[PDB]
Design a protein around this motif. Structure first.
Motif, PDB file in Angstrom:
ATOM      1  N   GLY A   8       0.962  -1.431  -0.141  1.00 12.22           N
ATOM      2  CA  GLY A   8      -0.040  -0.561   0.024  1.00 12.22           C
ATOM      3  C   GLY A   8       0.731   1.252  -0.208  1.00 12.22           C
ATOM      4  O   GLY A   8       1.978   1.402  -0.539  1.00 12.22           O
ATOM      5  N   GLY A   9       0.178   2.345   0.245  1.00 14.11           N
ATOM      6  CA  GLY A   9       0.964   3.587   0.038  1.00 14.11           C
ATOM      7  C   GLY A   9       0.885   4.547  -1.269  1.00 14.11           C
ATOM      8  O   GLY A   9       1.615   5.219  -0.869  1.00 14.11           O
ATOM      9  N   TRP A  12      -1.861   6.222   0.304  1.00 16.09           N
ATOM     10  CA  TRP A  12      -2.118   6.025   1.678  1.00 16.09           C
ATOM     11  C   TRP A  12      -3.349   5.585   2.148  1.00 16.09           C
ATOM     12  O   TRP A  12      -4.050   5.124   2.274  1.00 16.09           O
ATOM     13  N   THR A  15      -5.558   2.858   0.057  1.00 17.92           N
ATOM     14  CA  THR A  15      -5.097   2.104   1.388  1.00 17.92           C
ATOM     15  C   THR A  15      -6.131   1.810   2.434  1.00 17.92           C
ATOM     16  O   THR A  15      -6.115   0.882   2.646  1.00 17.92           O
ATOM     17  N   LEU A  40       0.574  -4.910   6.888  1.00 19.97           N
ATOM     18  CA  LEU A  40       0.925  -3.355   5.622  1.00 19.97           C
ATOM     19  C   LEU A  40       2.338  -3.463   5.613  1.00 19.97           C
ATOM     20  O   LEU A  40       2.820  -3.151   6.649  1.00 19.97           O
ATOM     21  N   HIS A  41       2.278  -3.292   4.880  1.00 20.04           N
ATOM     22  CA  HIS A  41       3.541  -2.334   4.066  1.00 20.04           C
ATOM     23  C   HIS A  41       3.456  -1.068   2.833  1.00 20.04           C
ATOM     24  O   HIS A  41       2.545  -1.293   1.698  1.00 20.04           O
ATOM     25  N   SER A  42       3.495   0.469   3.741  1.00 19.98           N
ATOM     26  CA  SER A  42       3.131   1.333   2.887  1.00 19.98           C
ATOM     27  C   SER A  42       4.929   1.859   2.632  1.00 19.98           C
ATOM     28  O   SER A  42       5.482   2.177   3.207  1.00 19.98           O
ATOM     29  N   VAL A  43       4.636   1.957   0.974  1.00 15.98           N
ATOM     30  CA  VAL A  43       5.640   2.346   0.242  1.00 15.98           C
ATOM     31  C   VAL A  43       5.633   4.275   0.585  1.00 15.98           C
ATOM     32  O   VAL A  43       4.256   5.394   0.606  1.00 15.98           O
ATOM     33  N   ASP A  44       7.073   4.747   0.310  1.00 15.81           N
ATOM     34  CA  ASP A  44       6.530   6.440   0.291  1.00 15.81           C
ATOM     35  C   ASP A  44       7.244   6.688  -1.371  1.00 15.81           C
ATOM     36  O   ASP A  44       7.491   6.254  -2.096  1.00 15.81           O
ATOM     37  N   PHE A  45       5.724   6.487  -1.330  1.00 24.87           N
ATOM     38  CA  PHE A  45       4.798   7.114  -3.449  1.00 24.87           C
ATOM     39  C   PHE A  45       5.957   7.753  -4.234  1.00 24.87           C
ATOM     40  O   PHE A  45       5.586   7.576  -5.234  1.00 24.87           O
ATOM     41  N   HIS A  46       6.332   8.863  -3.417  1.00 24.15           N
ATOM     42  CA  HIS A  46       7.693   9.662  -4.268  1.00 24.15           C
ATOM     43  C   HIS A  46       8.126   8.630  -5.451  1.00 24.15           C
ATOM     44  O   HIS A  46       8.768   9.133  -6.422  1.00 24.15           O
ATOM     45  N   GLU A  47       9.300   8.376  -4.768  1.00 23.51           N
ATOM     46  CA  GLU A  47      10.063   6.741  -4.938  1.00 23.51           C
ATOM     47  C   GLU A  47       9.206   6.086  -6.007  1.00 23.51           C
ATOM     48  O   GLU A  47       9.758   5.883  -7.041  1.00 23.51           O
TER      49      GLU A  47
ATOM     50  N   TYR B  19      -2.314   6.027  11.221  1.00 26.90           N
ATOM     51  CA  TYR B  19      -1.675   5.861   9.881  1.00 26.90           C
ATOM     52  C   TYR B  19      -2.290   7.430   8.702  1.00 26.90           C
ATOM     53  O   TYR B  19      -1.157   7.764   7.900  1.00 26.90           O
ATOM     54  N   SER B  35       4.710   9.869   0.933  1.00 28.40           N
ATOM     55  CA  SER B  35       4.118   9.885   2.229  1.00 28.40           C
ATOM     56  C   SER B  35       4.786   9.130   2.494  1.00 28.40           C
ATOM     57  O   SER B  35       6.536   8.535   2.777  1.00 28.40           O
ATOM     58  N   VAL B  38       5.541   2.637   6.076  1.00 23.50           N
ATOM     59  CA  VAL B  38       5.349   2.654   7.374  1.00 23.50           C
ATOM     60  C   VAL B  38       4.886   0.877   7.196  1.00 23.50           C
ATOM     61  O   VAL B  38       4.437   0.404   5.787  1.00 23.50           O
TER      62      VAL B  38
END
Ligand code: GLU
Lengths: 235, 235
Positions: A8-9, A12, A15, A40-47, B19, B35, B38
């Motif tokens: 996710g992310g 976010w 998610t 849950l693994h939430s990414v930095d969407f920027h990357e 979150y 983002s 997490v």
């Protein structure tokens, strides 16, 4: 129940409805204070967006597959990717992580075939409409024929998503234009319509579609729940 | 940025604000499409709450330490426990998972001493209000003392957290009630009030308070963002 792994992310905000619907489905089925076992693994969407914007889909698949493998290490027993568009790299995650991968188009395919249908339309971003990853998974797993809007409509439908629905504007005129496209596709043989993201469903209530609607993200969460309890397609 | 590990599902309704606020705080600070990184482990609350009921605290400590270790294996670099009550077993978690543990009291205690206060009101579960694990932490680490509501109000306060907030009933009857209890404690010389359950922020709008508010979820999520970006107290 099995523990589900969420990727996710992306974003976010999108998610949160996976987490909400999965917990609600578990609480509905198990009773009382029961809640969902979720990693849950939430990414930095920027990357991710930096890779996506340069078309470096191999890098994105490498990031997301590494994230799946981390969830598996923490004990997840299946993988859900909480974004339609990122299924561009589902094969990277499925081939590299031995956990069942619950593809968003497979959840929807199961719903489409459980409604006795072989021929549907797909509305979403232009990318999601025009790429092979969604429609192709439907045919490969199901033989479902997937209709898309013509090129001019794809461009209008996309523009509406990124200029309006993304910035919270659900307008009547956009609503009517979608319902007109759905109608055109209905007359070409479509028996149902897949809405590729939560926001299209926000714009077009099912009352306004002349076709049965399949909201691919809500369906996806509901299929996660079936997996965790080993129900129907996962028993 | 450092990946934060969240221990949630206690309840899942109260995990969502963590979150949201962590992502929101990361985007405010970094801008653009940034983002939060997490990892979240969301437990089945039925098990945890059964243990609390039974007095099997060591068992919840076992559950939560293993979840923490599982987050650490997936790449987490800090632990946030999204529940005040379960800080009663913070020591089993803090000793067996050696990631930085951002104790929920510490951030609130930093905020209390920061406004130059020492004696505050504490609303929470009966455990959080009545016992030493939490208020002993504020005393030990900051010499802060808490006044808690009377024995009848504590029972009502607790029934509201477990039967309503954790199952998603938020009501003005409850809210108003919490409001009136504050009034009384201000009158008793409490200089401020800690919303010492992570779902009293989901029920009471800050501006009904006659005392300054220290909202633990909000403060905790802010402390997470600061640790993730190594800002303020985190160097
Ligand atoms: N919202 C409560 C949860 C209580 C519990 O986990 O039983 C808290 O922060 O303590």
């Amino acid at each position: 129940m099995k523990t589900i792994g969420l990727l996710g992310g992306m974003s976010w905000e999108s998610t949160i409805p996976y987490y909400r619907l999965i917990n609600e489905g578990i609480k509905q089925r198990l009773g009382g204070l029961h809640s969902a076992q979720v990693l849950l693994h939430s990414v930095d969407f920027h990357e991710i967006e930096e890779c996506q914007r340069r078309g470096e889909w191999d890098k994105t698949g490498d990031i997301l597959a590494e994230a799946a493998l981390g969830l598996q290490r923490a004990g997840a027993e299946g993988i859900v990717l909480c974004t339609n568009t990122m299924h561009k790299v589902a094969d990277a995650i499925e081939s590299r992580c031995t956990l069942p991968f619950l593809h968003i188009a497979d959840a929807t395919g199961r719903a489409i075939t459980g409604a006795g249908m072989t021929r549907v339309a797909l509305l979403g971003t232009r990318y999601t409409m025009e790429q092979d990853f969604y429609r192709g998974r439907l045919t490969e797993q199901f033989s479902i024929n997937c209709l898309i809007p013509e090129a001019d409509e794809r461009a209008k439908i996309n523009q509406i998503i990124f200029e309006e629905l993304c910035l919270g504007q659900f307008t009547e005129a956009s609503r009517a234009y979608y319902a007109q496209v759905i109608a055109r596709l209905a007359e070409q043989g479509a028996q149902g319509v897949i809405f590729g993201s939560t926001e299209i469903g926000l714009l077009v209530p099912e009352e306004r579609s002349v076709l049965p609607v399949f909201d691919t993200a809500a369906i996806h969460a509901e299929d996660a729940v079936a997996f965790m309890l080993s129900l129907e397609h996962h028993h």
